[model samples]
Target: RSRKLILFIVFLALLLDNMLLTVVVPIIPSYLYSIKHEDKDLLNENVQVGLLFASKATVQLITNPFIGLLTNRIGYPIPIFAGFCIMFVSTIMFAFSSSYAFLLIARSLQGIGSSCSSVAGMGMLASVYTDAEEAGNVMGIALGGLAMGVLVGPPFGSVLYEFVGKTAPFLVLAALVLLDGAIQLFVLQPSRVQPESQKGTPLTTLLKDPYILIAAGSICFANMGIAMLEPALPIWMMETMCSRKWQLGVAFLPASISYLIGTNIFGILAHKMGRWLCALLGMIIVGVSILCIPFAKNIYGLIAPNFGVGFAIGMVDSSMMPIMGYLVDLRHVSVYGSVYAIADVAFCMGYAIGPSAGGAIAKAIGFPWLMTIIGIIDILFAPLCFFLRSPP
Candidate 1:
């Protein structure tokens, strides 16, 4: 049975892993703002403001590969443990962060440490499900965890930050990782031995895989869209349309529900037909959905479009992951972390900049016009997908 129980345990760990991560999405920027409020003179500009917000990703971009390599050589658990330790320290430090400089260091370490788990974690899960069919199911459930976290994370984090202090989020993350490590070490073991194909120069070998390169690139753009939307959309609503809590609810709720549905369906499809078609379909849906968002005015107007967007994103991202598992040698699973590292960093940059760009553009022109621009950028990738090839 390939240790399906361990697989399920990893999924449980991912659920909490994502929950901890999601809990911070809504609060971190605001928290950073609060930490830096007293130093207004030091950090005042919008571009600079965004940098403070994106510091963690910037650090991750630099550090993720190192963690990936280390995990490749050392095995998954050590890096996972290291990731937990780093997150533990970073979270505690966040509670006591007194200055922008202090917070910057803490957040940077947080990024570096956090990387250890996700890629390594996903890689391990992929090992459990080598048969593409099983890979699809496991990956689907795993992504379900990821999307659920993203969809629900911000609102939950917002609520928690409101009720507790900002530090509470970090504290919770610390405990969650600690628990994750415990589960991983004692409860989980691989059911089947993943064949180790790499003998030397794994970086050279991994980079040579064209599918990997394209998959990584696709993730980058999709992530860019996501990162831009998450932080920027809320700010735009507050500033441009005088959006209320109800309006925000209408805009986001569909996204959350639709994404969950879309991911589950996409997983099954990817399992059945392989990843290429599903990814193509997902990109097309997401591109069109963003285009529609610019055109819609009221809350109800956005429901279908956003739902479609969620569906599209799920199909695209979920398809690629399973394909990655097939294409890479099992020994290189640790190196797969870099696949995300590259893409997510780009997304982080886009996310940090996307909303601000949207706001500035909307201010200069209007919401519809700015969204049209966002849509055009998104749809350009439709052709780009031609560069990607599916596993047979």
Candidate 2:
């Protein structure tokens, strides 16, 4: 009961982090406009906004390794608390930001906070559950929370903005994170679970391991394929279906549900099929779905392919945890924090690069061609999964 409660708390923290991230999505443009009303010359408004969205992932990329190392040294609770503090402060900043610079700083802080909390929380989970299957199941449940946050945040923000005020949502999120911090400091004890006492191999050495490298690579490509569509998909919809503003947003509903289902189902299936096969199958589905996107003659045509892509995402994403668990077992020491950190780096890299790269490539060749290119990239990675042998 104690351990389950601890896991549940960590899950809520992750859920809150994800929700805080997406909450700004629906309101950012108007929020930016308000800040830039008289200072348009400060920077290119579009570029500034782009950076705002990218800043968190960028920070996560740079800080994940350090956070991982810190978690290993001090354990999870300190880092998780620090993450909550950083996010709480940032949310408060967002509530009061009167200038663009303040907003950018706040966004950067949130990114840093996210890295701290995520690596620590997952590391804690890895330490608590020794069984691969159980770890994967727990990961699926945590990810399910993330999916829910992504699903709910934008609409929640929009509704809050409409009814209450600008600061209401930010303040509310700040309060929630503050509460999370309280739980971490007073209630959550690292000593509750005895972590492995073995000293693990250095990350520099582990990076050279083919199995670890391939697993991380699979995660990266899957994320890239999903994120690559973020910028291009709406434009494609506008051109092909003449999609309304809200409709562009609505298009993701089916995919979101599909992703949730995929995460849980594939998380369990990995234990039966082996993580490698689960990932490979997911990659193939994702690649095929991406290729099918351009063939859609209408909005409804896009639905099936979108659902497939979502399912593929779930399959690939769910397999990662158990694979990492396998890697941790292969090591002489407790390296779950470091291993998960590397995986997080791959995730952050894909998200950081995907949209910017997708936009450039789509502009150079066109959306259909861009989708084709991404699909090919994913398909090429699919076969490589076969080489991702389990640690003997």
Candidate 3:
């Protein structure tokens, strides 16, 4: 009963956190403009928008390693709950926010809140789901929540903002978060939270491990190919094909749908074929799809490659995330906070750098060569999967 509920809470909380993460996208511009006529003056609204978005990621990445290291000392229940509370407060601040400073601070606070919740929820999952396949399956499900959040958020936010007030979206999201908190409190009562061998692992130790390094790299490669598309594709499609606005909007939807299904399915298959094989195969698929991305003559031509990339990303997460849990048990202390932290660092680095870095390369060499080169580079890295060891 407890394990199932813990699973439920982890999934539910993660889903909510992600929705809150992206829900501001369509609403932010409208929100900023509405208050422009009143007291506060706006400066470089576009740049401010970028800062508002980056601040959350920046704060979360800076705080993650420390959050994980600290979590080892305390354990998951109290820490996860505390993270949820931070999110709760952060969302409410969003509900009532007006000033640019408040907007900045609230977004940053949500980052810290996200850092805490993700680390602990992940740690909790690793701790409880002792079976390797089951761990992958559950993480697969939860990670899909991540894709779903990113998928649904923009439309949800835009509709809410258009039909309702700016405050309406955040307030509704805040209420869901509050109810999730209530569910967690009941599920994670003191007796339900198991005591593990909660020894603190030095952050440096985990970073220095070859297995950890291989796994992190495996995870990172999957995301960069996708991120590379985020900025480069829209402009490319616009000039060459004169793709319709709505078509561009749905261009990425194929990938999201594939990722959603892929994560759920490959996780179950990882154990049978072996995680290493799954990881390697996913990387190869990533490389090929990336190579195919720039070759599309029209928007319709782009769908296959996009779908392939998202599906492969799903495969990597399904195989790779569970490996972290198994490898930690085999090589490190039972505590998973620091181990999960390493994975988080890799994830954030790929996301933060992928678009900018991909854009830089695309600018220098043009899109075709850029995708071809990135695809080739990714293929070269696929061999790293050989370095990953399966848990006994």
Candidate 4:
């Protein structure tokens, strides 16, 4: 396959993958409410919605490392195709699912497919775009798909779920997955798995390196704040602002547009501005922005901090993503699957903990206090960015 085509596929996969990931957000609470027949007490929605949101990452956390290693031995194409197939099934399940059990299963299936596709996509990029200098632009572009899907999915889900039926949103996504799969088939031509394994760096060695661990940890912390915000924020917005369902989805627009700006900007500049500083600044902004979350009583009041969260997260990933590639070139084998696995694990861990725990924490201490603590924790952790080994 041509490198450009591969890049396009990766970008499409990540974008679509993330779209599928957050598709449930705008609809799930309502879906659960509709199905709560006699289980009102049993189906505590704040915590349960958080659980559904966390479910994808829950499986991803467990599977990422293994999928990382598997891609190295088997190469990228098979897992990628396998991932699309699984995603097809999962999306179909979501479109028609009538019960909570099916929703949970569909979401978890998506996690497995995501773990496979994302790792393989990164590995494929590493194979083609081998230089640290190229890393910034490449990952920035790929992550654009991620950032867009993440911020826009809620809006898309909300609008479609409101205008169309619940089944329509996922069915549309299912069609997109099918189109993406067909493109993968054409681009990634068959007969590619290696007979003998050419091993990359051992997972243990990479895990042992403080920089890798810390970089991954930084990425995890970056995601934790937002993931926690997802489940908690919707309920708050509806209650506090007297907003409707579609408005809840539209709420993400500023964050979405701003993240695209921040990601591309930092992706291009972090190399020159100093990667560590970008990361540090990202955390600091995230801290301050999250603290601003509880104070907003109107849509105009809310937009600024949410916008800041997306931008700050964009800065974190754009800076840290290239830094990981740079570290890979400096210290490890050219293979990126293993290291990016650590990235997936870190992201999944943050997501897994963020919503589930945030739900409980928000319930206990309330959102204001929860946001306060998370903001402080982000600021406290910002100092760790200085320890990274940057190019300059």
Candidate 5:
């Protein structure tokens, strides 16, 4: 449905996302805990752990909407390209960071960069695609990038950290980011441009659209499970299955492959089943996956359930493009600016809160008990999705 250009742009965005996230994700927990264990006076247990985990999201939470405002003010390319530059710089900054304070600052800058990319990229993509179905397919590829990054991070991270040290991975990632940004700047031209309506700051326009609010709410609950899984699942693996990293990766292989396929396939299926149904199914899958994690006994136990979870996210990703773009006025592409602010806010809240929530519950009870509670919270989203209006 789209020309080569659109696909290229989407892939560029995907590559950037993967390069940045995969570089940092695997080492961050180990790095934080190592510092905490070694330097007792640097920071307290909870504060170090919590801040290390939450600082990036916290900064994004505050600035993401403002980044949207910048998008509206400067036009799309500037923000998108600027984001790449910031990401490149921050990737290198990790190399110099020796303390938690330094790392936190780097992460905050990373958040800003990522926020800029997301807002600009989503708006630009929406401008290009006319049909919902094509947009869904494109989004599947984007979500697949995310899945690949998740799957690749741990193994690659172990190798990088072992050989090159904590900072080396990030420097490598920066080089990749630079290449991607250079491509976007020189070769990437947006396919289309839509007119703008009553132009104000992005934050000023937030929550004005009822549809956008509902879309944000759906992703918010979905990401609570998502955010929880990222930190908690890895930690769970480290604590419970230290011997099984390779095995766990093998088991989780299904999730990685299935999610990529499932997202694209679900995009087609959603067109047939209806977007709301598709979205609901996705949420249910995510919820049940969280619930199932508590019950898994070994690495293989996580395989089937995690696959389903990945499938759920794929469905959500597939359906989200059309539904989100639909929330905006066709004429004013800046509506994406507002909608993204909502999504950024929701994701930030979920990320900031989810890990700590999981950690607290795990400490108080046990992993299973904490997971059970999270699963319940996750499943509760099923009914909530029913209230959301389907895209027209």
Candidate 6:
């Protein structure tokens, strides 16, 4: 009962955190302009928008590792509860926010809350599900929660803002965070500290290990590949094919569905076929699919590749977390917090940089060529998966 409760709480907390991260995205521009009520220079407006988007990721990148280390020392529930509280406060701040500066502050707080919640929640999952295959299966479900958050947050935010009010969405978010906190506080039991033998492995030693290096690289590169199209794809479709807004939405639908399917399905495959094989196959698919994007002649031509990329990303995602858990156990390391924290950093870094990097490359080389470059990068990184070892 306790184990299931903890998992449910962790899933809900993570789902809420992920939802909050993107919930403001669709409403931000309209909200900003409404509050400011003035015409700003285009570049200035763009910069502000970018900063608003990047602020959360920037703070998360800086804080996630330390948050993980803290979770390792203190256990999960305290940090998880603290994260929910912080999120609640930030959501309320958003509800009442009047100025751009205040919004920035809210985003930063949200990022901190996200870092704490994610690290603690993930750490708890790893600690509780000690077996590698079981961890992968559970992480697959957790990944689905995270993906759903990203999937629904934007549309939900926009709808609430359009119909209900600016404050309405944030109020809803606040309620969710409060409920998550209540669950963490009352229902879930806290995890124990790491065993002494597993605590002996130093961060430096883990970094030096080739298997860790390969797994981290695979994660970083795969995420970068996934994010590379975020900024460029919509623009590319509109410019070249004169694609409608709804069509753009349709393009993403397949990828999201495939990702949902892949994570849930491939996780079990990883256990049966071995992490190394599953990782390799996933990366190869991602590389090939992304490479085909540049050659796509029309919107219809793009759908298949997008769907394939999403599935490949899901397959890759399913194995990386459990593989990291397996590696730590194999090395007799108890520091799941630090391990997952480092992985989070890799994921965040890719997300933070992918858009700008891809945009710049697309600007210089054209979007098609940009796809080629990122595809080659993924192909190069694919072999690193071979270095990953299964848990003994």
Point to the candidate with the largest TM-score. 4
TM-score for every candidate vs. truth? 0.73, 0.80, 0.75, 0.90, 0.79, 0.77
Q: Each candidate: what lDDT?
A: 0.61, 0.75, 0.74, 0.81, 0.65, 0.73
lDDT leaderboard ranking: 4, 2, 3, 6, 5, 1
> Arrange candidates by TM-score, highest first: which order?
4, 2, 5, 6, 3, 1
lDDT per residue (tens digit) for residues 1-392 in model 2: 46786688778888999889877764665555455553223224444555666678898888876876666666677787788899898999998986878878998999999888887777677777868668756776776787887776756676677567788889889888888778777875646333356647776677677777788788888888877765456546655686544455456667777888888677667878887788889999999999998998777898898899989988998877667656756663545456555677778888887766666666556778988998999998898987767554
228 Cα displacement, candidate 3 (Å)? 3.9
Candidate 2, 343: how far from true, in Å? 2.2
Candidate 5 off by > 4 Å: 1-10, 38-47, 124-151, 184-215, 244-254, 320-342, 388-392
Question: Which ten-residue region of model 2 has the weakest summed lDDT?
Answer: 38-47
Shift of residue 33 alpha carbon in model 6, Å: 9.6
Comparing candidate 4 with candidate 6, which one achieves the higher lDDT?
A: 4
lDDT of 2 at 26: 48
TM-score computed on alpha carbons, candidate 6: 0.77
Q: Which stretches of candidate 1 lie over 4 Å from their true place?
A: 1-9, 29-46, 96-99, 122-137, 163-171, 181-215, 243-253, 270-278, 294-302, 322-370, 386-392
Q: Model 3 lDDT vs. the true structure? A: 0.74
Off by more than 4 A, model 4:
37-43, 69-75, 128-137, 186-190, 193-198, 328-334, 389-391
Per-model clash counts, in order, read: 2, 1, 0, 0, 0, 1
Model 4 lDDT tens row, 341-377: 6676678889998998887776666789989999999
Question: Clashing pairs in model 1?
Answer: 227-351, 228-351
Residue range with the least summed lDDT across 10 consecutive positions in model 1: 38-47
Off by over 4 Å in 2: 29-50, 69-75, 95-100, 124-140, 158-168, 182-197, 231-245, 271-275, 294-301, 327-334, 363-365, 389-392
Higher-scoring candidate on lDDT, 3 or 4: 4
